[PDB]
Write a protein that binds this ligand. Structure first.
Ligand code: TYA
Ligand code: TYA
Lengths: 317, 317
């Protein structure tokens, strides 16, 4: 209803399976949603914050988030939004990394709330031990090759080339949504733009096994200059303060271009509309002041790292 | 060398991966070959005898056959030579059926020979317990979707439609050839016409994992009238004497059309060339006698059922 309008307004809704459908339910019930995380590194990064912060926002309007760590799938590899086939990582690496991601994840969610506290889960627990035969019959039977072949993630790669391994990724992710629906009452799966195919894939698995649930994608982060967001010359801007220091984190935000700043405040912060509009007026009336740029930077650094870190960054700058 | 020439002559060689390559090895070593059987019913049928009898022939020239029972794959379903998607059978049914097939299989092979006795094996033993993750990474990584999509079995079905389940069948079969190569020194996989794709699939898995082995397909059984061999008005001609009695079996063969008879003697019998040519002359000189028709029928009934059964059929007719 209004949470969906806010998101809309903030510009956090790229697509939704059935908006009137979802808006209805969001307003009538406490909705369990998940979002999936693949240990693709030893740290999450600012590409992951929109989705992370969106969960929070869903939590704050009283809904319950399951941060999902991908111990099994990050063992497979999601072709989505990748032009090339990736390298398969070792179980040990993935295992190692899973533990960290779980840690960064837990900072953004509320585990003490009563009625809607998070859960952080690992699909390795239900993927780990499912036998091949069972997967192909139980899950595979439900998907035609041609449904699968039409996915943006796949269609985008067939001449490029794609391992059968990567080709089946969507099936796992598919399966995830089903276990979470069955065991946790999970009705919404949200994600970034590139994840739409894998979300619907899960809705196709649910419909076909039960015959109820939604999908919402967040747009990928835009730049007015047409360059790739978060891609600095120094390299990725991590969430691990040992990977990217609080000062560096801080400075990244402080260097937001006038063109981006109101979009980023909307995406990454908890300032109200009334506050954001106010900053918009000051960016117009006094853009050398850099009022919106400091508010963004303070707000986000506090979120990720906390006041002391913030206090340090500011004092260091 | 000469075994391959014989087969050639008999007309049992539709295709071979590398004939000079295989001919060489067949003449220089004791070759381990397998042939795969899917419990698709509670009995094998005369569609299966060419392949079965071919193994025997390979055994007789001193080679070692592994009759393979498909407890796992017949749980999946091979699209090959099927225009439509099949129904998935119960584990229990497949399990039940596996036991019978193993029994009919064992009749055609020599288990007492020293140096080249058969083995009857079940891919359920190595497929049964392989986890999904392991399969997609260990086996899937090696095959592009586009290699797979070009297979006769698959390409022949995409508009028709094909479950991902059936789409992956070739991967299992793929895997089979690899375990058998690794654990049994198996270098040749033979099969019927429709199996070429799945054979090569296994050679692609071997090359790519090791960097040696061959594939030979037997033609599907021809009729001069253009109808489907073994398809009677009474229904399938089984190998189970409780499904098709010895008399019925016998009569089926005895009703061979003049057009087929020399081809069938070549395919299903152990008569020499000199003998087959002799019968060819008598079919020419005296075709009302039905000399080739009785020799076929006697020879084959003895093979499948034994003399007493034969004696009965003849006395019953
Ligand atoms: N700039 C950005 N803007 C917005 N979102 C961004 C950006 N960068 C990354 N993301 C997102 O952050 C999440 C990270 O997912 P992933 O590791 O990349 O794979 C995703 C999935 N395969 C993991 C998964 C595994 C199992 C499962 O059940 C569900 C999901 C995704 O929703 C992705 O859309
Ligand atoms: N008229 C006929 N002429 C000649 N051959 C015929 C005829 N009718 C049936 N066959 C053959 O007999 C064998 C029976 O195999 P299948 O049950 O039908 O599936 C075949 C495979 N999916 C089973 C398998 C499973 C696992 C594995 O590793 C290998 C193979 C095959 O080689 C097939 O080609």
């Amino acid at each position: 209803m209004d949470l969906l309008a806010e998101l809309q307004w903030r510009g956090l809704v790229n697509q939704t399976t059935d908006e009137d459908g979802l808006r209805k339910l969001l307003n009538e019930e406490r909705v369990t949603l998940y979002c999936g995380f693949d240990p693709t590194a030893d740290s999450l990064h600012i590409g992951h914050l929109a989705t992370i912060l969106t969960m929070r926002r869903f939590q704050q309007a009283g809904h319950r988030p399951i941060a999902l760590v991908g111990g099994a799938t990050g063992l497979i590899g999601d072709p989505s939004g990748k032009k090339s086939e990736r390298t398969l990582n070792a179980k040990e690496t993935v295992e190692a990394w899973s533990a960290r991601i779980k840690e960064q994840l837990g900072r953004f969610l509320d585990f003490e709330a009563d009625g809607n506290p998070a859960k952080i889960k690992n699909n390795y627990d239900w993927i780990g031990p499912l036998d091949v035969i069972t997967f192909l019959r139980d899950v595979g039977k439900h998907f035609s090759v041609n449904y699968m072949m039409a996915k943006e993630s796949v269609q985008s790669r067939i001449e490029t080339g794609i391992s059968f391994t990567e080709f089946s990724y969507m099936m796992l992710q598919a399966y995830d949504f089903l276990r979470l629906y069955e065991t946790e009452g999970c009705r919404l799966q949200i994600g970034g733009s590139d994840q739409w195919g894998n979300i619907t894939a899960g809705l196709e698995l649910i419909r076909k096994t039960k015959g109820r649930a939604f999908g919402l994608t967040i747009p990928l982060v835009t730049k007015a200059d047409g360059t790739k967001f978060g891609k600095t010359e120094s390299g990725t801007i991590w969430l691990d303060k040992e990977k990217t220091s609080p000062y560096e984190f801080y400075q990244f935000w402080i260097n937001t271009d006038d063109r981006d700043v109101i979009r980023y405040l909307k995406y990454f912060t908890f300032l109200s509309k009334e506050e954001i509009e106010a900053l918009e007026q000051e960016l117009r009336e006094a853009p050398e002041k850099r009022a919106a740029q400091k508010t963004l930077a303070e707000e986000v650094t506090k979120l990720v790292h906390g006041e002391e870190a913030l206090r340090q960054a500011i004092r260091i700058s």
